[PDB]
Amino acid sequence: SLPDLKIEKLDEGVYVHTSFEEVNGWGVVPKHGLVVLVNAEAYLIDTPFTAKDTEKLVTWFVERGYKIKGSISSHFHSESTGGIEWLNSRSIPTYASELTNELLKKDGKVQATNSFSGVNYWLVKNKIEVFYPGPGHTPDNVVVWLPERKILFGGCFIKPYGLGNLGDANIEAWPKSAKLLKSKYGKAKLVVPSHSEVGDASLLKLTLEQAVKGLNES
Ligand SMILES: [Zn+2]
Ligand SMILES: [Zn+2]
Numbered sequence: 001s002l003p004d005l006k007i008e009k010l011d012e013g014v015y016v017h018t019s020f021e022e023v024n025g026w027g028v029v030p031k032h033g034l035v036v037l038v039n040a041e042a043y044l045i046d047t048p049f050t051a052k053d054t055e056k057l058v059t060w061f062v063e064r065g066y067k068i069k070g071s072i073s074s075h076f077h078s079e080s081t082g083g084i085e086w087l088n089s090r091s092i093p094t095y096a097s098e099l100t101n102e103l104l105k106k107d108g109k110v111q112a113t114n115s116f117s118g119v120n121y122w123l124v125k126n127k128i129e130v131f132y133p134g135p136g137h138t139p140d141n142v143v144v145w146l147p148e149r150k151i152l153f154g155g156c157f158i159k160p161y162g163l164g165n166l167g168d169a170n171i172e173a174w175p176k177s178a179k180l181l182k183s184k185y186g187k188a189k190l191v192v193p194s195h196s197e198v199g200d201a202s203l204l205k206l207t208l209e210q211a212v213k214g215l216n217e218s
Pocket of ligand 1: 075
């Protein structure tokens with residue numbers, strides 16, 4: 001009995017989708033992603049944990065007149081890639097970095113159909129930018145910047161209260177990656193983490209501090 005998928009408007013043209021999964025140690029984990037709307041078309045910023053919630057998400061937008069143009073996954077964990085199988089099965093384009101696809105392949109998981117690399121990649125010119133700050137939460141973690149509304153989807157890289165699951169983390173690299181991210185997006189109005197409430201650019205500094213503290217404790 002999991003909480004239902006939630007879809008809530010965050011700003012003009014930007015929705016937060018929240019899906020839930022039981023993960024041992026944490027209890028039920030809420031996972032936030034975005035849906036970005038440009039001219040009657042929708043881009044998914046992360047997928048829900050499951051095919052079922054991915055279909056629910058897609059259908060909600062389809063029934064409101066939107067065409068699903070693609071999804072992008074911020075890292076390989078299922079909280080961000082759980083819907084790739086379903087989307088690929090509906091011939092909806094999926095994106096992930098080369099690094100993410102390699103970690104999916106290695107895990108016996110279905111890969112995104114489209115991949116990219118480099119420090120930054122424009123999923124949609126002037127509207128949706130993918131940025132790779134370096135390894136942290138995972139080796140492949142990327143963020144998504146919406147320059148018009150100044151909204152940064154930080155995913156699991158933004159960890160302002162504690163770093164969380166270190167199983168796939170690069171504790172030595174995270175402070176350098178977090179300094180770079182803070183430098184890059186200090187102009188953010190909103191910063192959307194995966195598992196906690198939306199905040200402002202202070203989440204970037206708080207994440208850096210947590211990364212430093214975690215390195216110094218290792
Ligand atoms: Zn993760
Ligand atoms: Zn997470």
